[PDB]
């Protein structure tokens, strides 16, 4: 009968792909409540570091200050979120921002014209100076400790090339953004994942075999590599049901729709985690499981109140 | 015609005639027809329905019978008509991009959508009339699903994260005229001047109004705040 | 509103985790209840969903001019082939999982790409409340107009209705 | 207005791929499918985000009153 | 490929607005019945 150790015997992991930006790995023999729990946590509960309070001194752009501020919020920073603790609110602004709780980014760009580009329609980058405002203009402003602490992890936008704003000569932007620690549940800009999703393993139960040119003729009904045929005089097999997209195109044809059933494997989960660059996606998963555990420790630790 | 309209050949060339093109087949060239002569004219709606010895013209395109907005509405020929008319009321009442010279207009109100897109689905008259100059909406991933229990009858759900990424973010402009000539009055004075004199005013007004009596452009203003001095 | 006059208020800004997510790993932007269609028959909107989905995948604009299609060349067939060539359900549905629990729903959900437009009637602005305010001197009754924070009228029909209830102390 | 930072639906940052995509349609004279595929926009939420954009700011900027014209 | 995007054409038109003729001549032609009407009070036959 059930024990957590019989699950531990039954639970398996297979890691399909581990890139520093994507992890596609499978969890066989787990419960949906747990996979959905991790997915959900990976989205909402994993803390990330994002600009939060942008202090403008001037914005002469044709872009609205508020909108641009939201965009600076949207910018993902390549920052290990473990460099900072949470900032309370019970307390005054002078205590709110410290080098232990805040990251400062200054942006001071002044747009000019350039000294005379060839004809006339040269790329505004040729005709104008600082016409393109990129994430590369986020000046990192350390304080003391964190100046040293970031010696080998300076704060950079995970894509400096992101166009943030376009200016014109004499236009200028001066603002100082306050980047803090936040969770993707409180706002999507704090979500460290671009897409963390799971999908149940497609299962293709072939009820009676199909063969010959109907077997390859069926094979073209599925993604190239879902159905494998070794000889087809004897079988058309499923090379990998994981390749399928459940287009259910086979159902258009009775030639097959009467000797196969298409279901799923509740136990097998196909994770797809793409990271926004703030953290490597698997490490984000590590934090997600440590988060669920810390919550269970919190619930053990809590005294039942009444 | 037996008890018909009184016969005659009434030509008209004068002003205010409403005129519309149709393709005259015997000379295969465009001809301008008005509503009076149309009554007795056999205009096939498409070339394959041209009936022998009957249709003397054919429509260039059946879109020629719709107004501009009805062509902007995709597949309007697939929905119940009153839904197309409410489409005219919605798209016509839609907050979109009103212009681009908005920093040089001064309407009592303007509504400007910042996130504009070009429909994937459109009539070719969407390009031919250039409505792409002022896109009024956005292409959304929609699931037609009752699922949450708040999508019934007339209520629809948005992803919170989508708004958090700026989805449908919009702005509203209200323009104001601050006049100092309410009574303009006879004309022994007209002195009101923006600024101060008594010092006794709350100096916290400088937090909003510059030493010229006008607020700093860019200023956050809340109900109660002074808009000028 | 869609470009089809199927207008709706946003009832709620659903948490992303709680939204349904597709096997493509996405959660829709907008959810419209299907039960609106049987009366409205906004089937042009269905075709716009399947056309915007196809057209996003292959990455091209689709012409929606009235009568470009034919009873023997239905759009469901055109985009059925386009979408199915893309690698997607020929009918265009996709197996989605519950945001909340995570199970696969009974059936494949109809998802697509639809142009939605924001009506200027941001009914956010139409709220109003008055527990105290100005009164007309000719009545000592709440003044009129939102900017006067005036009070809504209890009309004759509402008078009638309160008399219906027997609620004479509420009517007084 | 301006190329959105992220795809509303997915969450993938897209704001970096505008200038490169437009360059790929001009410079590489590529087609929309192949260019967006080289950009990694392998989901139609990602596809639609950039594909439908109308960078209207270029029209706005000629109205800049802070420089003589 | 039926109603293709004029994307380069558009963005070029945004960057370098027309210097000789508006596109969308139907757009100018739509208010033609107004403007022409007003011109007949200042230019036309007799004056």
């Amino acid at each position: 009968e059930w024990n957590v150790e019989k699950f531990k015997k039954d639970f398996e992991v297979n890691i399909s792909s581990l890139d520093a930006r994507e992890a596609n790995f499978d969890l066989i023999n787990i419960d949906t409540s747990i996979a959905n729990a991790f997915r959900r946590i990976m989205i909402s509960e994993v803390p990330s570091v994002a600009a939060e309070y942008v202090y403008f001194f001037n914005n002469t752009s044709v872009i609205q200050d508020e909108v641009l501020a939201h965009r600076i919020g949207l910018v993902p920073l390549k920052v290990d979120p473990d460099m900072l603790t949470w900032v309370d609110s019970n307390l005054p602004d002078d205590e709110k921002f410290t080098d232990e709780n805040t990251i400062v980014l200054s942006l001071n760009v002044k747009c000019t014209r350039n000294p005379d580009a060839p004809k006339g329609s040269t790329d505004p980058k040729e005709l104008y100076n600082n016409a393109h405002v990129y994430a590369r203009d986020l000046k990192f402003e350390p304080q003391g400790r964190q100046s040293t602490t970031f010696a080998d992890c300076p704060v950079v936008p995970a894509d400096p090339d992101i166009l943030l704003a376009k200016l014109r000569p004499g236009q200028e932007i001066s603002l100082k953004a306050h980047c803090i620690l936040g969770i993707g549940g409180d706002h999507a800009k704090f979500s460290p994942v671009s897409t963390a999703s799971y999908r149940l393993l497609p299962q293709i139960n072939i009820l009676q075999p199909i063969k010959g040119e109907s077997a390859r003729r069926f094979q073209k009904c599925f993604p190239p590599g879902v159905i494998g045929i070794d000889e087809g005089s004897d079988e058309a097999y499923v090379k990998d049901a994981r390749k399928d997209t459940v287009s259910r195109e086979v159902l258009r044809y009775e030639e097959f729709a009467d000797k196969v059933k298409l279901g799923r494997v509740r136990n097998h989960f196909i994770f797809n985690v793409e990271s926004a660059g703030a953290m490597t996606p698997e490490e984000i998963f590590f934090k997600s499981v440590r988060i669920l555990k810390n919550k269970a420790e919190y619930l053990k630790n809590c005294p039942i109140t009444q | 015609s037996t008890r018909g309209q009184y016969p005659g050949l009434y030509l008209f060339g004068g002003h205010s005639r409403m005129l519309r093109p149709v393709r005259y087949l015997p000379l295969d060239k465009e001809d301008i027809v008005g509503p009076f002569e149309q009554v007795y004219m056999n205009i096939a709606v498409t070339p394959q329905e041209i009936q022998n010895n009957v249709h003397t013209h054919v429509e260039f395109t059946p879109t020629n019978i719709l107004s501009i907005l009805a062509n902007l509405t995709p597949f309007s020929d697939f929905n119940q008509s009153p839904r197309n008319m409410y489409q005219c009321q919605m798209g016509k009442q839609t907050m979109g991009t009103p212009g681009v010279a908005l920093c040089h207009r001064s309407d009592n109100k303007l509504y400007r959508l910042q996130t504009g897109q070009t429909p994937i689905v459109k009539a070719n008259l969407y390009d031919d009339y250039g409505m792409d100059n002022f896109p009024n909406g956005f292409n959304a991933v929609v699931a037609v699903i009752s699922y949450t229990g708040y999508d019934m009858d007339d209520a629809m759900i948005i992803n919170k994260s989508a708004d958090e990424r700026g989805f449908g973010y919009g702005t509203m402009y209200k323009t104001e005229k601050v006049d100092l000539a309410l009574n303009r009055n006879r004309g022994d004075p007209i002195t009101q001047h923006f600024g101060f004199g008594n010092d006794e005013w709350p100096k916290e007004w400088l937090e909003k109004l510059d030493e010229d009596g006008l607020p700093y452009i860019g200023t956050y203003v809340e109900e109660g705040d002074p808009i000028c001095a | 509103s869609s470009r089809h006059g199927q207008k709706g208020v946003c009832s709620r800004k659903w948490p992303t985790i709680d939204m349904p997510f597709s096997e493509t790993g996405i959660q829709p932007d907008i959810i419209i209840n299907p039960h609106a269609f049987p009366s409205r028959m906004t089937i042009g909107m269905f075709v716009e969903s399947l056309a915007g989905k196809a057209g996003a995948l292959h990455g091209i604009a689709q012409d929606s001019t009235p009568w470009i299609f034919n009873e023997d060349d239905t759009p469901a067939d055109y985009f059925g082939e386009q979408l199915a060539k893309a690698g997607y359900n020929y009918h265009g549905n996709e197996p989605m999982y519950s945001g909340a629990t995570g199970e696969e729903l009974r059936a494949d959900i109809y998802v697509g790409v639809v142009y939605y437009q924001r009506l200027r009637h941001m009914v956010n602005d139409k709220f109003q409340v008055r527990s105290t305010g100005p009164v007309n001197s000719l009545t000592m009754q709440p003044v009129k107009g939102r900017k006067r924070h005036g009070g809504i009228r209890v009309g004759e029909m509402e008078r009638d209705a309160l008399i219906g209830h027997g609620t004479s102390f509420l009517l007084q | 207005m301006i190329v959105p930072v992220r795809c509303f639906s997915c969450g993938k940052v897209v704001g970096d791929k505008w200038e490169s995509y437009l360059n790929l349609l001009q410079e590489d004279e590529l087609d929309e499918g192949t260019a967006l595929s080289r950009l990694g926009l392998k989901r139609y939420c990602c596809r639609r985000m950039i594909l439908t954009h109308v960078d209207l700011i270029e029209k706005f900027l000629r109205y800049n009153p802070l420089e003589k014209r | 490929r039926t109603a293709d995007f004029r994307t380069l054409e558009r963005e070029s038109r945004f960057i370098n607005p027309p210097k000789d003729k508006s596109a969308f001549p139907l757009l100018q032609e739509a208010v033609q019945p107004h403007i022409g009407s007003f011109n007949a009070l200042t230019e036309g036959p007799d004056g």
Binding site: - | - | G25, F69, G87 | - | -
Partner: peptide
């Protein structure tokens, strides 16, 4: 009437999560 033509580049642009045209 002639039916509107299907696109010429009607080709697979979608894969499962985990895959590419490296399997095509």
């Amino acid at each position: 009437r002639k039916d509107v033509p299907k696109v010429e580049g009607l080709k697979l642009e979608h894969f499962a999560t985990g895959y590419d045209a490296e399997d095509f």
